Every structure is written in structure tokens, then in C-alpha cells.
Amino acid sequence: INGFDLPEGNVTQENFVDMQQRCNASDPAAYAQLVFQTCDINAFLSEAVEGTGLAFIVFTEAITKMPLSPLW
Amino acid sequence: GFHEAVGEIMSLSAATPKHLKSIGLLSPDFQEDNETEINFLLKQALTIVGTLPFTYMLEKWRWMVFKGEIPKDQWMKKWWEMKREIVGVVEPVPHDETYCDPASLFHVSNDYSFIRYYTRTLYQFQFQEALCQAAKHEGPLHKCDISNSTEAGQKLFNMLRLGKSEPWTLALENVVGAKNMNVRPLLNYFEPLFTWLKDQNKNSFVGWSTDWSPYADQSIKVRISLKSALGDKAYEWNDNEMYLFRSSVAYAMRQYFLKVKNQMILFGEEDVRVANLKPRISFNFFVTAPKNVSDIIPRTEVEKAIRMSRSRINDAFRLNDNSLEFLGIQPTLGPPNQPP
Amino acid sequence: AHLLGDMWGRFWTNLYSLTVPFGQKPNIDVTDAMVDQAWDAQRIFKEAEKFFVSVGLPNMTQGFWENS
Lengths: 72, 340, 68
Description:
This is part of a larger assembly, with one copy of chain A (72 residues) and two copies of chain B.
Chain A: H1 16-26, H2 53-63
Chain B: H1 2-8, H2 11-14, H3 40-48, H4 52-66, H5 75-87, H6 106-109, H7 116-131, H8 151-160, H9 169-173, H10 184-189, H11 191-194, E1 220-222, H12 239-259, E2 272-278, E3 282-287, H13 299-308, H14 310-313
Antiparallel strand pairs in B: 1-3, 2-3
Helix pairs in contact in B: 1-7, 4-5, 12-13
PDB class: membrane protein
Keywords: ACE2-B0AT1 complex, membrane protein
Entry title: ACE2-B0AT1 complex, open conformation
């Protein structure tokens, strides 16, 4: 919706890619300026660490995804 | 127009001194020269080509006003986008629906049907390249002097023996075989300057950007993301929240100009000009003077004006300055001092 | 739209001052030289009587001279 501007209600992790086809169909020019960051589970499960990072630079992140984040 | 067509090539004969010396005016001391006619076609291009889209739109702007497809809040609205579309000229100052600068001319202010210039323009160029080679005198090509040359006028006489016996495209085919019109003799006498527009205008930039203005630089794009601060379960932004905003924009100037500029100037929400309304509550805006609308507020002071009351407006819509995006204005705060 | 030579942008002939390689030589410079040559509204037609007969096309009569 940055460059191609749909209403914020009618966009979700959905036909986003299908509406992207309508965005590229309505215009390819501004469509060639909007970079999208492709993502995947097992592109987020494929990163790991061993030895020390699991509790020191990995677990403490999901600690901060808690409503009582200093307590846990 | 027809009359004007043959009449202003006869007002051309009023503008030539060639038969004036042979109908009894001033003696020649001003004999003509050679080269100019390769660059005289340039001078015709500033006159006859410069007026073609301008005089077209104002009649077309008048008609959709006249048949009532343009409501009476849309005149200066409809006046300028076609000057950007058809002419590619822009206004140097934005105009509200009070000014009516179409009325500033002669013929709109005094009721003339202004399409009379196009008909005469079309028939005029179909004639001249097809006839006056046999006008018995051609030095300079504008000296097709039918005065002392009968022979060319008798091919012209096939239209001249007629009144309103019928339409004019039969009078057109009495001369050059024209049946509706042709834009080709326009294109043909500018065909030496069609390619010459790739001689001194070879270095190519095609078209124009159809939305630039010299005041577009002072407009600020504001970008609202309701799915970022309030997220979901939030209220649906509509034209009220448009109207809430411009009131709260007008806020920021009053708070600026008396706490910083320190004199009172009044502001309505209508001074906050709204352009390119998008669902994502995104639009480029700028503010003007209240009703000295010839002059607008310089953006350089608006940038500090927002940064003074930036904290005022996010909680005016439950937002977080990442849903108050300004693209040139960003929050510069937050030093922490937790330890004693 | 204030850079076109005129007020409303019709004729750009006064922009022929910086857009030229060349071009010179004026047209009739006798625009007031008939004012003191003094052909009135019927001597201009007595002279234009000879204008179009050299084109061969006829001239105007019957009211063109009389009632006016």
C-alpha cells in the first residue's frame, strides 16, 4: 500500500499477492520500485545457533514477547 | 470562419505593400531580401500553433458548464487540469472557486462563440498550397499577388459565385476537392519544420510530467497507518476524519504563529488544502493564507510548526508518530535517565 | 502560465526573441500612412475598384456608394 495504495481494510496476508498482480497490471512502472521481503517458515526455522546463543541471543527475544517480559 | 479564412488572407493582402505601390501608396525604398523564409516558418509556429489547444479547451470547458455536467463548485477545478492535460501548462498559484480567470479574456466576457477560429483555420491551409503557384508572381512565397493576376482567382471563383446555396464542404470541393477537412496541409507546410523539430530540437525529452507545479514543493505528504497504532478494532476513517484533521491542522499554525511569530493570523480548516485523497489516509497537503489565497504559507516554517505540536495530534487520533508520517519530519526525542 | 508574452497565452510571437537563429525584415510600415493619404470610405472603394479587376473578380455597387 506504500506505492500502490489499497485501502487498509481490503489488504491482509491473503490475496495480497493476488492484488499485487492487479497492481502490476494497473502499472508496472511503480511496481518496479516496490521491493518485497520474501519470508518463509523454514526460512525462519533454518537459522540456528549452538553452544551459547540459544539462551543468550535467541531465548531472550521471545522473553521480550511477553506481557510480563522482565519477570520471565 | 470561412469568411475569416479568405478574409484574413485578404487582411494579409491588407498587410502587404506590394499592391499598395500599384494602387497608389508610398514609393518603394524597402525592397525585400532572401533568407528569412527558412526561419519565417518558425515565426508562424509561435502564432498559428501556439493558439490551437488553448482555444480548443475553453469552448469545451464552456459547453460542459453550459449543459450542466459541471456543478458550480468546479469551474476553476475544471479549468486547470485540462490546461495540464491538453496544454501542459500549470497555474503558478492554486485557485479556489471564486476567481473565474476564464472570464479575464475578451470573448468569454462579451459572449462570443469562440469556435469560429478553427473552421477558417482548416480551410485556409488546404487552399494556399494548391492554388497560388499559378498566381503569376512568386518571389517571397507570401507574395502570391492575385492583384495583377487574374488566373488564380478564377479557380477561386467556383466558390465565389455562390451564396448560401448549400453547405461549405461542397464549396470546399469546388476548390481543392475537400469533403470534410484535412489536417494534412497543416502538416504539409509544417513538414519542413516537423523534421526540423529534430534539427534544433533533436536532443530528446518526450512529453512532460503532467502533475508538477512550482508550489508542489511546499506540499507535505502525510501518511496515516491505522493498522500500526490502533491496529484493528479501530474506527473506519472516512470524510469526517478528513474534516477532523484540517481543523486540527489549523490548530498547529495558530499555536505556532503567536508563540513563535507572535502576531495573530486566523485560520480555517479550508485553508488546509487536501490533494490526492487515498484510503490509507495518505494525501499530500499544504496550507495557505486564510483569504489572501494569492499567497501561501512557506513550508520551511511549517516544518518547525509541526515539530512543536507533533505530540498534540497523535493522541488526537490515538496514534504513535509511526502512524503520523510526514516524510521530512521525524521525532527527535527520548533521552533516558533511569539510574540515580 | 505567466511566461508566454501575452496575458492568456494565445500568440507566442513575442517569444520570437530568444528562440531564433535568425529572421528579420518587417511587413507594411505604412499603417498610418493612409491616414494622412486621406482616402475616405468611398475613395477606398474607388481604389479597390481597381484592386479586384486585376484579380478579375467583380466589385461592389448598389448601396456600396450611395446611402451611407
